[PDB]
């Protein structure tokens, strides 16, 4: 809607003109308000996709995502606003602008409507997140990390761009609605195959694929947490959103081209999860868990059965929240002891309890047990996958094994057990910490009561 | 609590003795039979070479280790405190290090005026003490040998480490 | 065979530790702030706990849920079909209460035990 989008722009003047020591309150409060306004969008319709201006629309597929994306800003603020303090006022005030500018690009790029507009925003997101990773990440490697985050997107995105232009020349309009209606099959040959990869590879890069995911861990190792929460919880998911969009064309060719990527995914899930079982340091462990779940989304998209898209939507959102949650929840330790390496934390439960509780809830929904929307999101795509091939279950099952283990593992290794002796640094949990993660996890649990509003268009 | 020292023959054969004797109880179960075979066992250690030249003796050990290892029993009895244990660390959930209390903030700290008072007395004692352990450690030490710790001579003696361990069953 | 310096060390530390543990002991040191406190204390002024405690406790935990949930019963069962599906009773040779009927068969069996 054009109504939600203006105020999101309007916080910027408010940020710059805010009194130097009050800005956090301004940005926080109004970001919360605009979240609540975003929530009214959720209504959708049971038949026709909701429409607005000529240049926007709001499919059910977008709405829960939009609500989420609006919802994250305050969270990143609450996480950030103690991570930085000694920074100069102008620089901080400069800093939140990156975040909000970013979500502005998201609210624009979810409602689309032209796939060229959708693209140019899809790639426009790249800048602020780059700036954030590079200027406010800790340790040296972040510099290098910036590059991996960058070219892997562009090297994917650029051909997609040319492909898009091509279609609006071989057919009429590039607009999504009509192309949903005017859609006509493309088939074999050889030109059409390169069309296929051209319209898939960028989306399959931005949500990491197993053969290509290398940048993602090395982004998460580096980025300051506000960059981490977005880079994990959202951008992956948007790549998925777009790939769900463009599949309105293609067919029947997808039937013939899915196989290689279904192999990289069905194998890469078990593989990356296996690597996930033996990390040195936590902040990476979480990242590989994230890839290990995104593989499920990507096969869920490619088998193209309606159950699979339902499960696609659900898992996208659930993994969003749970991953962001694990990240902030890890940064807390990293700030309390600067260890980063998981081994040093040791008996953290002994010294403070409530965080152990959040570890419990968060990991617990990471492994996905009923009736978490994570789980129910996952079970559908196992169903449709199983319809697609009866063998496939033997792969999915192994996932559900290892995702148990390492998940519980991150719990039992960084918590249960003896305190390290000399680490006096810990200081008994701030209110904002508990507030923050309670803010992640409560929506995630209420949300199970009413799935029917999250399953998306193919409900 | 008496660290290191590169090993010697006598203590070696001794530990083999306590060990074998214990597994021997683990077999004999009854106090009776165990007593009998125990006396028989020590009788074996003396009746054999209670005195001998070393070069034979080590061979006697190499014999004994095998003869034990064959008979060592799938699982010995183990007291709960011991590393086997039915409760080797049941209470490590509880033994919170002292410095952590030093964090409660005044509304809690007011409620135990006495204990906190005595505690600052201690902490004072330490912060006052420390340079002396510095100079002494610096003094008694050569470049730095195998031995750990060094004797008191007029005050204090690296005590804060052990003296303020959080007892054994805090809860 | 302990070295004497080790002996004095262990002695010193033993003394200091017993001193510590003795220091750990508290006396009348256990304490509390004055303690709505009236919201609890006023209610206890007239309660006869020996029977009344079981009274109120049982009142809540068994009386409220059944009233509520049965009211929810008139909701969901009266509202919709197939919310509740009975096994339907076995009907032997004896007459139904629905409308008499039913009959015994043959009884040609003979001998016993």
């Amino acid at each position: 809607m054009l109504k939600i989008i203006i105020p999101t722009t309007m916080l910027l003047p408010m940020t710059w003109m805010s009194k130097h020591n009050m800005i956090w309150i301004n940005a926080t409060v109004h970001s919360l308000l605009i979240s609540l306004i975003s929530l009214s969008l959720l209504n959708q319709l049971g038949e026709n996709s909701l429409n607005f201006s000529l240049t926007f629309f709001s499919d059910s597929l977008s709405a829960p995502l939009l609500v989420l994306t609006t919802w994250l800003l305050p969270l990143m603020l609450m996480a950030s606003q103690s991570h930085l303090s000694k920074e100069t006022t102008t620089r901080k005030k400069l800093y939140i602008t990156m975040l909000i500018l970013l979500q502005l690009f998201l609210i624009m790029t979810f409602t689309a409507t032209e796939l060229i507009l959708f693209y140019i925003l899809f790639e426009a997101t790249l800048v602020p997140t780059l700036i954030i990773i590079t200027r406010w990440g800790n340790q040296t490697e972040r510099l290098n990390a910036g590059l991996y985050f960058l070219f892997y997107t562009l090297a994917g995105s650029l051909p997609l761009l040319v492909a898009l232009v091509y279609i609006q020349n071989t057919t009429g309009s590039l607009n999504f609605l009509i192309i949903h209606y005017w859609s006509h099959p493309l088939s074999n040959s050889w030109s059409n195959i390169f069309m296929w990869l051209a319209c898939i590879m960028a989306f399959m890069v931005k949500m990491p694929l197993y053969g290509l995911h290398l940048w993602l861990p090395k982004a998460h190792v580096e980025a300051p947490i506000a960059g981490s929460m977005v880079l994990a919880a959202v951008l992956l998911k948007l790549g998925g959103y777009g790939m769900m969009r463009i599949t309105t064309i293609l067919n029947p060719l997808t039937n013939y081209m899915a196989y290689p990527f279904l192999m990289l995914s069905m194998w890469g899930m078990i593989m990356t999860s296996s690597i996930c079982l033996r990390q040195t340091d936590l902040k990476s462990l979480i990242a590989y868990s994230s890839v290990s779940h995104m593989a499920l989304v990507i096969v869920a998209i490619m088998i193209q059965t309606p159950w699979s898209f339902m499960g696609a939507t659900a898992l996208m959102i659930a993994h969003g929240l749970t991953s962001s949650m694990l990240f902030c929840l890890a940064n807390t330790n990293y700030e309390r002891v600067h260890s980063r390496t998981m081994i040093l934390a040791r008996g953290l439960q002994t010294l403070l309890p409530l965080m152990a509780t959040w570890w419990l809830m968060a990991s617990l929904t990471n492994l996905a047990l009923p009736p978490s929307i994570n789980l129910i999101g996952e079970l559908f795509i196992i169903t449709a996958s199983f319809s697609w091939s009866n063998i496939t279950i033997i792969l999915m099952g192994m996932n559900m094994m290892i995702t148990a283990l390492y998940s519980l593992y991150m719990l039992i290794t960084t918590q249960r057990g003896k305190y390290t002796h000399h680490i006096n640094n810990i200081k008994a949990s701030f209110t904002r910490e508990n507030a923050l993660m309670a803010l992640h996890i409560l929506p995630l649990l209420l949300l199970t009561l009413n799935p029917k509003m999250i399953l998306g268009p193919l409900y | 609590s008496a660290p290191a020292a590169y090993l010697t023959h006598q203590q070696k054969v001794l530990r083999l003795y306590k060990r074998a004797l214990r597994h021997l109880e683990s077999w004999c179960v009854h106090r009776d039979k165990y007593r009998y075979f125990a006396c028989l066992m020590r009788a074996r250690f003396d009746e054999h070479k209670n005195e001998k030249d070393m070069v034979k003796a080590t061979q006697l050990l190499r014999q004994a280790e095998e003869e034990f290892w064959y008979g060592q029993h799938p699982q010995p009895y183990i007291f709960p405190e011991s590393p086997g244990g039915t409760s080797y660390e049941r209470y490590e959930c509880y033994k919170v290090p002292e410095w952590c209390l030093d964090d409660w903030h005044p509304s809690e700290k007011a409620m135990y005026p006495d204990y906190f008072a005595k505690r600052e007395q201690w902490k004072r004692l330490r912060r006052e003490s420390w340079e002396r352990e510095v100079k002494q450690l610096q003094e008694e030490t050569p470049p730095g040998g195998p031995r750990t710790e060094a004797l008191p001579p007029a005050r204090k003696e690296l005590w804060w480490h052990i003296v303020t361990r959080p007892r054994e069953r805090p809860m | 065979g302990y070295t004497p310096d080790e002996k004095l060390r262990l002695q010193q530390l033993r003394e200091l530790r017993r001193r510590w543990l003795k220091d750990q002991e508290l006396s009348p040191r256990e304490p509390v702030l004055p303690p709505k406190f009236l919201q609890d204390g006023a209610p206890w002024k007239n309660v006869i706990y020996k029977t009344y405690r079981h009274s109120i406790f049982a009142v809540t935990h068994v009386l409220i849920p059944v009233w509520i949930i049965h009211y929810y019963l008139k909701y969901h069962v009266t509202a919709k079909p197939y919310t509740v599906v009975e096994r339907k009773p076995r009907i032997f040779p004896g007459d139904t209460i629905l409308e008499t009927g039913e009959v015994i068969p043959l009884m040609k069996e003979f001998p016993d035990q």
Partner: peptide, 12 residues
């Protein structure tokens, strides 16, 4: 009571 328990602050 008789002896002082240690325990992390539970106030926060």
């Amino acid at each position: 009571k008789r002896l002082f328990i240690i325990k992390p602050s539970g106030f926060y």
